[PDB]
């Protein structure tokens, strides 16, 4: 059983993803204050996946949960052109935490289905992903609503975790 944090700004689609992953469907959500924790099985691997709220005021607490984290699913709204700089700077901050030194990063460029979506390449550049030191990471175009791209991202994460010292 492996530990995953689903992180990202409020409204990104984190919760939608969690339950899309667990029960294979889209459900109606509220802003997660506190946290949701559910156990997800994919391609026969067991994950304890934790969804935490992204609200401005509840972001400082993310770090309290970084302990023994195997992977971060970092969900970014591809249509939110306004706060992608915040997504960048908050991602920069979290990857500096010693707890996460060993952690695998997967970026969900979410809401890809939408007309106003930034390109996968544009987002990667925006987040300074190529500027990442010692990170095994990949970016994925996704739609939690439509089910687009999730299995592709999960296949990547699963194979990547199957890489042991």
């Amino acid at each position: 059983e492996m530990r995953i944090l689903i992180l990202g700004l409020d409204g990104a689609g984190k919760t939608t993803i969690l339950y899309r992953l667990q029960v294979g469907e889209v459900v109606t959500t509220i802003p997660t204050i506190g946290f949701n924790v559910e156990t997800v099985t994919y391609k026969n691997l067991k994950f304890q996946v934790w969804d935490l709220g992204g609200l401005t005021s509840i972001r400082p607490y993310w770090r309290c949960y970084y302990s023994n984290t195997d992977a971060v699913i970092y969900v970014v709204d591809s249509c939110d052109r306004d706060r992608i700089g915040i997504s960048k700077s908050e991602l920069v901050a979290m990857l500096e935490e010693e707890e996460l030194r060993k952690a695998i990063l997967v970026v969900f460029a979410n809401k890809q289905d939408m007309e106003q979506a930034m390109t996968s390449s544009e987002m990667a550049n925006s987040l300074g992903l190529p500027a990442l030191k010692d990170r095994k990471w990949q970016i994925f175009k996704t739609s939690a609503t439509k089910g687009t791209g999730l299995d592709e991202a999960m296949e990547w994460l699963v194979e990547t975790l199957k890489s042991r010292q």
């Binding site: 109606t28 506190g34 023994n68």
Partner: protein, 194 residues
């Protein structure tokens, strides 16, 4: 919508405790009479707000099969965070404490020492969290303390590092939430006088 599914699932695990089985059936029936995605529905009044429908859960928490305690703590956490369990006047107990303070006391009462199932332990920590911090419901400050206590208890006496660092986390969050609420209550007091 969640209610129905979860209650039927409640019937499945064991009937060796017949009283629990019967209470689940009666609550399910009242739901059918009031009616006349498997995770819980939205706040609105059209959905018949489940308040005293509660009682088969008090059973579920005090049941012994820890997988069904864990189940109970979960769905409680869910619907209370959705704003579906607002609470009311004191029921089957002395006043000076609302029904909300009762459910919280029954979730605090699932943890008794390091022996208790860890799935339950976490579920508690989680329910306790979205309870204290629900935009939707105020708490008697003594019930707050009991919440805090049960959490700190799980933190100190756990032997599951996950639950330790998450109880430490929700501990911080809870204290900071309730403190801020006390702060602006006092500042509204310092300004309404003016």
């Amino acid at each position: 919508r969640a209610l129905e599914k979860i209650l039927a699932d409640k019937e499945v695990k064991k009937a060796h405790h017949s009283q629990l089985r019967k209470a689940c059936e009666v609550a399910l029936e009242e739901i059918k009479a009031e009616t006349e995605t498997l995770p819980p529905v939205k706040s609105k009044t059209n959905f018949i707000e489940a308040d005293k429908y509660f009682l088969p859960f008090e059973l579920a928490c005090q049941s012994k099969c820890p997988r069904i305690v864990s189940t109970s703590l979960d769905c409680l956490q869910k619907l209370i965070a959705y704003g579906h369990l607002t609470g009311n006047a004191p029921d089957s107990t002395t006043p000076g404490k609302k029904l909300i303070d009762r459910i919280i006391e029954t979730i605090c009462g699932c943890f008794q020492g390091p022996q208790t199932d860890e799935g339950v332990q976490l579920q508690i920590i989680k329910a306790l969290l979205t309870a204290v911090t629900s935009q939707h419901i105020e708490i008697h400050e003594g019930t707050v303390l009991q919440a805090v206590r049960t959490c700190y208890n799980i933190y100190l006496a756990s032997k599951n590092l996950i639950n330790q660092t998450t109880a430490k986390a929700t501990l911080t969050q809870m204290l900071n939430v309730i403190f801020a609420r006390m702060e602006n209550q006092a500042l509204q007091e310092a300004k309404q006088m003016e």
